[PDB]
């Protein structure tokens, strides 16, 4: 059987996966024959190449035996065999050999981090997370960056190192992940530091988020400012939301600011905000805004104010026609 | 015997191949809340707090004093000073107790 397996390994088959399956079957037969060390030796001999092997496995010019070092299935089988048979040093050597061939996916980096965490090693898990982040920056490690952030939160690292890691993870991240990253950074700044850093992170997120989540981020920042500080601190930022949000979003922000000013007592500021919203929205297309302005004028506003509101509505109707 | 010395973390024992995160992502194996799990309940809590504040403002007729300034000024600085005065307060209390004991010994 060993001679037949060696002859099949020496047969240049078309598919390298066929040779990998034959090697895995030989290793399984050796393991069933109480030769797990011999199986690991045969697996290492099958995945034997130089320190800088760069032969593409998809290239249909070399033999499948030569293009067998970049086999992910054979490497995974060898790692699984050596995980329950050797110590952590051989597992680290196998991980380094897999990283040398650049055939390790984000799942491989996650498995290496889990193996490091299972061996009472947290700095090595952070090193593996950094390797996963550096090997694939933008798309393929945002989830790995989230896992690294979770590990750092569970490790209770120092504030400077955590801030540096959060800045590195949110440096060139896409906005769909950068919104959650900035929210987590603000939560960490509020939990383990002053609220000024969280406010600055929220302000940066309000200027660096997607247009769909810009209004939600602005509302969350306003709620956080009202919870952690005074409600007047959101007075200018909402004014900034007047200059940044989209037309319906700016109308909603102006309505919220007018409600806040009416609650505080700024009747003139609320009337000016309502007039700006009426100037920034058609009367026939935004009847809810006109109804809210009329309700506010009934709650606060005279007959002259009602006539001015009617004139503004007529002007908006003329502009929309 | 073959499926007894394997970690079964990245190799599928049924498909005889590498595990894929499209159907079995590793984030479901975490014992804590990830970044996808986080930043979602906080937004819901903020929305619920805003709705409760709006309902309280609609129900009430006068402006609450602890609604525009729910926290005192420099509250973060006060919290930082309280956190930094962890062993300093204990040292001051020990010094006060030592002074009281010295005064009692001088009286006695």
């Amino acid at each position: 059987a060993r001679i037949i397996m060696e002859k099949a390994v020496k047969v240049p088959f078309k598919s390298v996966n066929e040779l990998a399956d034959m090697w895995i079957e030989w290793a399984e037969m050796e393991l069933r024959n109480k030769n797990f060390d011999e199986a690991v030796r045969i697996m290492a001999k099958a995945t034997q190449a130089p320190k800088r092997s760069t032969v593409d496995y998809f290239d249909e010019s070399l033999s499948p035996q030569q293009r067998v070092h970049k086999s992910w299935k054979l490497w995974s089988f060898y790692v699984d065999l050596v995980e329950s048979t050797s110590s952590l040093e051989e597992t680290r050597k196998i991980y380094e050999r897999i990283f040398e061939l650049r055939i390790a996916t984000p799942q491989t980096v996650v498995n290496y981090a889990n193996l490091l965490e299972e061996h009472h090693y947290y700095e090595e898990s952070f090193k593996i997370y950094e390797r996963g982040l550096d090997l694939f920056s933008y798309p393929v490690a945002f989830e790995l960056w989230n896992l690294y952030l979770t590990k750092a939160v569970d490790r209770k690292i120092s504030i400077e190192r955590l801030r540096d890691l959060f800045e590195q993870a949110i440096t060139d991240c896409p906005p769909k992940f950068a919104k959650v990253l900035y929210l987590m950074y603000g939560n960490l700044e509020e939990e383990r530091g002053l609220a000024r850093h969280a406010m600055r992170i929220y302000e940066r997120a309000t200027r660096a988020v997607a247009d769909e989540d810009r209004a939600d981020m602005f509302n969350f920042y306003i709620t956080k400012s009202a919870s952690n500080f005074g409600l007047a601190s959101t007075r200018p930022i909402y004014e900034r939301a007047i200059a940044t949000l989209p037309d319906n979003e700016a109308r909603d922000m102006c309505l919220k600011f007018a409600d806040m000013e009416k609650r505080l007592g700024e009747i003139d500021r609320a009337r000016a905000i309502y007039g700006h919203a009426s100037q920034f929205c058609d009367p026939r297309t935004n009847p809810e805004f006109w109804a809210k302005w009329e309700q506010f004028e009934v709650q606060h506003g005279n007959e002259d104010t009602f006539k001015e509101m009617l004139r503004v509505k007529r002007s908006v109707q003329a502009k929309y026609n | 015997p073959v499926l007894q010395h394997l970690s079964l973390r990245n190799y599928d024992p049924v498909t005889r191949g590498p595990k894929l995160g499209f159907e079995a992502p590793p984030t479901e194996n975490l014992n804590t809340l990830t970044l996808e799990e986080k930043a979602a309940a906080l937004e819901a809590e903020a929305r619920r707090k805003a709705q409760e504040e709006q309902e309280a403002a609609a129900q009430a007729r006068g402006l609450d004093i602890t609604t525009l300034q729910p926290k005192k000024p420099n509250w973060d600085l006060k919290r930082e000073f309280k956190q930094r005065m962890a062993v300093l307060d204990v040292r001051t209390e020990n010094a006060i107790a030592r002074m009281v004991r010295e005064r009692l010994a001088e009286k006695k």
């Binding site: 005074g230 007047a232 505080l264 007592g265 700024e266 003139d268 500021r269 000016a272 700006h276 100037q279 920034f280 | 402006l63 004093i65 602890t66 525009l68 300034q69």
Partner: peptide, 29 residues
Amino acid sequence: RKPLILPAPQVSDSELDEIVKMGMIGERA
């Protein structure tokens, strides 16, 4: 959007500050 020059409010940030000082003084009383 054309820039709307909003007028200065009749109550300022400092005036609102002393207003909420008096408000929390009444509340704590």
